[PDB]
């Protein structure tokens, strides 16, 4: 979701709950770690 | 100076003083975390005396 | 975090409840007045959860009691008869 709709609000709920570095870490490393 | 009594509070000034002393004691007594800090009516949610 | 850097991927003590506390903090951010009581309550809940998981790991998973018993026996001379016999045997080496 992230930034891909308009009225949607959960798409940014993590972005308000989590900091951008921590959000990016959680979002990127989990699939990365799974594939590695 | 005896003049320091608040006339509007004067009828209740003694009770006020006793209550203030009691609250200062309770907050100043190392009370165990008393459950009577109910998470219910916050003092901020308590209507102020005003 | 420092232990999980070295420890295998054992999840957070609060695991999925971390986000719940994040939502509570977001509600606090949405609160028009800062209440120390609610903040302290949430902090204490998180603290208690983490402390309970740490205690469980230390006592059951990390056998804190065995280490304390070892320390008593050796550092605290808990095996007083053993350390007495050791002193009696090593005295000639350790008297110098």
Curated annotation (Swiss-Prot), chain B:
UniProt superkingdom: Eukaryota
Tissue distribution of the protein: Widely expressed, with highest levels in heart and skeletal muscle and moderate levels in brain.
Subcellular location(s) of the protein: Cytoplasm, Cytoskeleton, Microtubule organizing center, Centrosome
Assigned protein family: Belongs to the TUBGCP family.
Subunit structure: Component of the gamma-tubulin ring complex (gTuRC) consisting of TUBGCP2, TUBGCP3, TUBGCP4, TUBGCP5 and TUBGCP6 and gamma-tubulin TUBG1 or TUBG2. TUBGCP2, TUBGCP3, TUBGCP4, TUBGCP5 and TUBGCP6 assemble in a 5:5:2:1:1 stoichiometry; each is associated with a gamma-tubulin, thereby arranging 14 gamma-tubulins in a helical manner. Gamma-tubulin at the first position is blocked by TUBGCP3 at the last position, allowing 13 protafilaments to grow into a microtubule.
Task performed by this protein: Component of the gamma-tubulin ring complex (gTuRC) which mediates microtubule nucleation. The gTuRC regulates the minus-end nucleation of alpha-beta tubulin heterodimers that grow into microtubule protafilaments, a critical step in centrosome duplication and spindle formation.
Name assigned to this protein: Gamma-tubulin complex component 5
Protein species of origin: Homo sapiens
Gene of this entry: TUBGCP5
From Swiss-Prot, chain C:
Tissues showing expression: Ubiquitously expressed.
Annotated compartments: Cytoplasm, Cytoskeleton, Microtubule organizing center, Centrosome
Superkingdom, taxonomy of origin: Eukaryota
Family as reported in the entry's similarity comment: Belongs to the TUBGCP family.
Record: disease: Microcephaly and chorioretinopathy, autosomal recessive, 3: A disorder characterized by congenital microcephaly and chorioretinal dysplasia associated with poor vision and nystagmus. Variable ocular anomalies include microphthalmia, retinal folding, retinal detachment, optic nerve hypoplasia, absence of retinal vessels, round areas of chorioretinal atrophy, and attenuated electroretinogram. Most patients have mild developmental delay and mild learning difficulties.
Main function: Component of the gamma-tubulin ring complex (gTuRC) which mediates microtubule nucleation. The gTuRC regulates the minus-end nucleation of alpha-beta tubulin heterodimers that grow into microtubule protafilaments, a critical step in centrosome duplication and spindle formation.
Subunit structure: Component of the gamma-tubulin ring complex (gTuRC) consisting of TUBGCP2, TUBGCP3, TUBGCP4, TUBGCP5 and TUBGCP6 and gamma-tubulin TUBG1 or TUBG2. TUBGCP2, TUBGCP3, TUBGCP4, TUBGCP5 and TUBGCP6 assemble in a 5:5:2:1:1 stoichiometry; each is associated with a gamma-tubulin, thereby arranging 14 gamma-tubulins in a helical manner. Gamma-tubulin at the first position is blocked by TUBGCP3 at the last position, allowing 13 protafilaments to grow into a microtubule.
Name the record gives this protein: Gamma-tubulin complex component 4
Organism expressing this protein natively: Homo sapiens (Human)
Residue range from the parent sequence: 287 to 382 of 667
């Amino acid at each position: 979701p992230q930034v891909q709709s308009a009225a949607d609000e959960t798409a940014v709920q993590l972005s308000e709950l989590l900091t951008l570095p921590v959000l990016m870490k959680r979002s990127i490393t989990a699939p990365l770690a799974a594939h590695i | 100076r005896q003049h320091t009594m608040v006339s509007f509070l004067k009828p209740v000034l003694k009770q006020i003083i006793m209550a203030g002393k009691s609250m200062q004691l309770l907050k100043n007594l190392q009370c165990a975390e008393s459950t009577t800090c109910q998470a219910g009516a916050r003092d901020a949610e308590r209507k102020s005396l005003y | 975090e420092n232990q999980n850097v070295n420890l295998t991927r054992k999840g957070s003590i609060l695991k999925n409840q971390e986000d719940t506390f994040a939502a509570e903090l977001h509600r606090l951010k949405q609160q028009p007045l800062f209440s120390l009581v609610d903040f302290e309550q949430v902090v204490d809940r998180i603290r208690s959860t983490v402390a309970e998981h740490l205690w469980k790991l230390m006592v059951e998973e990390s056998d804190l009691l065995g280490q304390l018993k070892i320390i008593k026996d050796f550092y605290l001379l808990g095996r007083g008869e053993l350390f007495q016999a050791f002193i009696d045997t090593a005295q000639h080496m350790l008297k110098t």
